[PDB]
Design an enzyme around this catalytic site. Structure first.
Site, PDB file in Angstrom:
ATOM      1  N   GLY B  50       5.026 -29.393 -70.594  1.00 17.26           N
ATOM      2  CA  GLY B  50       5.766 -28.847 -71.729  1.00 17.26           C
ATOM      3  C   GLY B  50       5.249 -27.468 -72.100  1.00 17.26           C
ATOM      4  O   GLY B  50       4.117 -27.093 -71.767  1.00 17.26           O
ATOM      5  N   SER B  51       6.087 -26.712 -72.793  1.00 17.36           N
ATOM      6  CA  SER B  51       5.636 -25.502 -73.474  1.00 17.36           C
ATOM      7  C   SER B  51       4.729 -25.886 -74.652  1.00 17.36           C
ATOM      8  O   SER B  51       4.672 -27.068 -75.041  1.00 17.36           O
ATOM      9  CB  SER B  51       6.863 -24.712 -73.962  1.00 17.36           C
ATOM     10  OG  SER B  51       6.477 -23.543 -74.671  1.00 17.36           O
ATOM     11  N   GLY B  52       4.030 -24.895 -75.209  1.00 16.99           N
ATOM     12  CA  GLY B  52       3.003 -25.146 -76.217  1.00 16.99           C
ATOM     13  C   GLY B  52       1.567 -25.163 -75.739  1.00 16.99           C
ATOM     14  O   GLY B  52       0.658 -25.294 -76.554  1.00 16.99           O
ATOM     15  N   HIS B  53       1.348 -25.031 -74.433  1.00 19.49           N
ATOM     16  CA  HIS B  53      -0.008 -25.018 -73.899  1.00 19.49           C
ATOM     17  C   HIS B  53      -0.366 -23.701 -73.232  1.00 19.49           C
ATOM     18  O   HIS B  53      -1.437 -23.592 -72.635  1.00 19.49           O
ATOM     19  CB  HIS B  53      -0.203 -26.182 -72.917  1.00 19.49           C
ATOM     20  CG  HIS B  53       0.100 -27.528 -73.507  1.00 19.49           C
ATOM     21  ND1 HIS B  53      -0.581 -28.035 -74.596  1.00 19.49           N
ATOM     22  CD2 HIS B  53       0.999 -28.480 -73.153  1.00 19.49           C
ATOM     23  CE1 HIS B  53      -0.112 -29.239 -74.891  1.00 19.49           C
ATOM     24  NE2 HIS B  53       0.851 -29.531 -74.032  1.00 19.49           N
ATOM     25  N   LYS B 101      -0.385 -33.557 -64.988  1.00 20.66           N
ATOM     26  CA  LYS B 101      -1.222 -33.998 -66.106  1.00 20.66           C
ATOM     27  C   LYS B 101      -0.865 -35.437 -66.521  1.00 20.66           C
ATOM     28  O   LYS B 101       0.316 -35.809 -66.522  1.00 20.66           O
ATOM     29  CB  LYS B 101      -1.127 -33.005 -67.279  1.00 20.66           C
ATOM     30  CG  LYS B 101      -1.675 -31.608 -66.962  1.00 20.66           C
ATOM     31  CD  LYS B 101      -1.699 -30.691 -68.189  1.00 20.66           C
ATOM     32  CE  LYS B 101      -0.408 -30.726 -69.009  1.00 20.66           C
ATOM     33  NZ  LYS B 101       0.791 -30.232 -68.264  1.00 20.66           N
ATOM     34  N   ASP B 106       5.416 -36.914 -68.386  1.00 17.49           N
ATOM     35  CA  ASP B 106       5.217 -36.050 -67.210  1.00 17.49           C
ATOM     36  C   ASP B 106       5.230 -36.907 -65.935  1.00 17.49           C
ATOM     37  O   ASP B 106       5.795 -36.513 -64.911  1.00 17.49           O
ATOM     38  CB  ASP B 106       3.890 -35.284 -67.277  1.00 17.49           C
ATOM     39  CG  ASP B 106       3.806 -34.341 -68.455  1.00 17.49           C
ATOM     40  OD1 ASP B 106       3.428 -33.162 -68.250  1.00 17.49           O
ATOM     41  OD2 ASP B 106       4.111 -34.772 -69.582  1.00 17.49           O
ATOM     42  N   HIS B 197      -2.135 -33.059 -78.610  1.00 14.07           N
ATOM     43  CA  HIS B 197      -0.960 -32.884 -79.445  1.00 14.07           C
ATOM     44  C   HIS B 197      -1.232 -33.135 -80.943  1.00 14.07           C
ATOM     45  O   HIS B 197      -0.301 -33.399 -81.703  1.00 14.07           O
ATOM     46  CB  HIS B 197       0.172 -33.816 -78.970  1.00 14.07           C
ATOM     47  CG  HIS B 197       0.721 -33.447 -77.625  1.00 14.07           C
ATOM     48  ND1 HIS B 197       1.198 -34.378 -76.729  1.00 14.07           N
ATOM     49  CD2 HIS B 197       0.865 -32.239 -77.022  1.00 14.07           C
ATOM     50  CE1 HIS B 197       1.612 -33.761 -75.635  1.00 14.07           C
ATOM     51  NE2 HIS B 197       1.422 -32.463 -75.787  1.00 14.07           N
TER      52      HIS B 197
END
Lengths: 321, 317
Positions: B50-53, B101, B106, B197
């Protein structure tokens, strides 16, 4: 915060930087970080200023960039004694060139050191970085602080020095480059509100509004930069761009903003011939972005920007491409 | 926040990265970012999530690392169709290796695409990153997410691939490396073992300086690694900021951590410090340790890449 360096040199941070990079050494109790691979064969460029803006200037010390940077307490410049110490160290009789950001306190300490070094036979020369086109909230005169565009002096002067430029030639290059650089920033704060032209220490912006998306933020900053640069009226359409996060803005937001800004600058009829995006000069953990524009007044400046360095915050170069 | 990518691929971000970096190309609407320099002579490694990392994993795309990364919406992995798109493109009949991951979502998405690719004749193989030693705050079973030490897989496998490693040999190396990697984080009150998260830490306490924080993290790492029992005292360290922690705090923390590791009798042989894998704008740091189980791993770490978040190498020294 995990550490606070009010009133003290950030000794732990500088020791950690030394431990991380084989090519950097820190002198404890001095704030001086230096490129230990520097061989004295070329004219050295140095700089410095308060902590709270990292990686300016510790991340710009290395081969092809600064020979040394001297870091003071949080938002307080280094003492002239430590600046003078750094000048004497890098000096070898070929001159020493200093980049100073335009703040009253920084001017005082560097002036004092440079004056003293010159009485000792050292040919120190300097340029003052003054790219901030935000304005003072009191009388609406430009603040002219040295802000993120300072790093273009570090990069271009460091690369021309490394290629063999003389102290006289580096000074003349600096005098040509420094007037070309313009920087304007914006910050967000909760009440969400958006402050355009926020100062590098949070000083008030010229306009504050409700957040209603970043497209309109990009439009405003571009329009305010246009009012100073007047690129509409200038034949040379080639520009260098920095998109700089001021501390707590995410990479997602920075590259999204870069995308909006690049689309606008394309529509303005400009060619962005070099850009760099990231946390390049921060203000603690401020949520904001600044944009820097600089005319490619000499095409060679692109060569100087693209050449590889050993400084941790500018490791990229055109062999990547 | 200037932009919010809840529910959608961060399309402008990806386009922006593309405009910045000549050696990177983005494929609109897919979340696929790829190294346009990749020549198909070596086995490709790819990842995603995901985006955000960020920079995980867009910053780790480039020569010597990932040949492509596939990015989904905020904290949501990419859809299998886009993963499989990526696999087909990097493929040239030499196999393809995927680093995944360890999150349920995922795993579902990558599994769907991997088995599909396999039935199309592609020799795709994978490793699952599971370095997080944080614990579910009730019951204390380890979470085993893949977190910042994932990038050790990218860098080591990438460099071995680049060197001419076979798909067979890359899998063997991945199985060797993955269990060596251990990571624990802390947020700022101090919350130890915060989830990637934002899930609760195992202990919350009053901030009383970061020396006590380094002590607590190193102690928990020790409980898993047991370095005092092993004759090989060589380690790789990552000091990772989780989003809004400053460089001054990160290098200060490295210093305090290295003070303790040296008193433990360890030699940290490679260190990397920065925003390596974040969680939005969270204020926090994670530490990763990995045994230099094979001395060649250091060569693989020190070799130059074209990925934007990993440009240091041994010629700087």
């Amino acid at each position: 915060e995990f550490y606070n360096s009010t009133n003290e040199i950030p000794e732990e941070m500088l020791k950690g930087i030394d431990l991380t990079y084989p090519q950097l050494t820190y002198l404890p109790e001095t704030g001086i970080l230096y490129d230990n691979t520097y061989n004295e064969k070329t004219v050295p460029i140095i700089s410095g200023g308060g902590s709270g803006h990292e990686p300016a200037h510790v991340g710009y010390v290395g081969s092809g960039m600064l020979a040394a940077a001297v870091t003071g307490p949080l938002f307080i410049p280094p003492k002239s004694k430590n600046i003078l110490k750094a000048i004497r160290q890098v000096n070898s009789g070929k001159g020493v060139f200093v980049i100073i950001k335009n703040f009253e306190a920084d001017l005082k300490e560097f002036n004092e050191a440079i004056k003293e070094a010159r009485t000792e036979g050292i040919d120190v020369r300097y340029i003052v970085s003054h790219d901030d086109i935000s304005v003072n909230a009191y009388n609406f005169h430009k603040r002219h602080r040295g802000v993120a565009g300072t790093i273009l002096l570090h990069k271009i002067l460091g690369a021309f020095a490394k290629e063999g430029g003389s102290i006289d030639e580096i000074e003349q290059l600096a005098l040509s480059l420094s007037p070309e650089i313009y920087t304007l920033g914006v910050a967000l704060a909760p009440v969400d509100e958006v402050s355009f032209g926020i100062g590098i220490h949070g000083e008030p912006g010229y306009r504050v509004e409700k957040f209603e998306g970043s497209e309109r933020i990009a439009i405003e900053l571009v329009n305010k930069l246009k009012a100073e640069i007047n690129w509409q009226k200038k034949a040379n359409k080639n520009y260098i761009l920095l998109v700089n996060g001021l501390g707590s803005t995410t990479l997602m937001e920075l590259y999204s903003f870069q995308y909006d800004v690049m689309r606008l600058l394309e529509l303005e009829g400009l060619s962005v011939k070099f850009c760099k995006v990231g946390n390049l000069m921060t203000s603690c953990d401020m949520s904001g972005i600044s944009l820097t524009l600089c005319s490619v007044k000499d095409p060679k400046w692109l060569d100087y920007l693209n050449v590889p360095t050993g400084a941790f915050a500018w490791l990229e170069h055109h062999h990547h491409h």
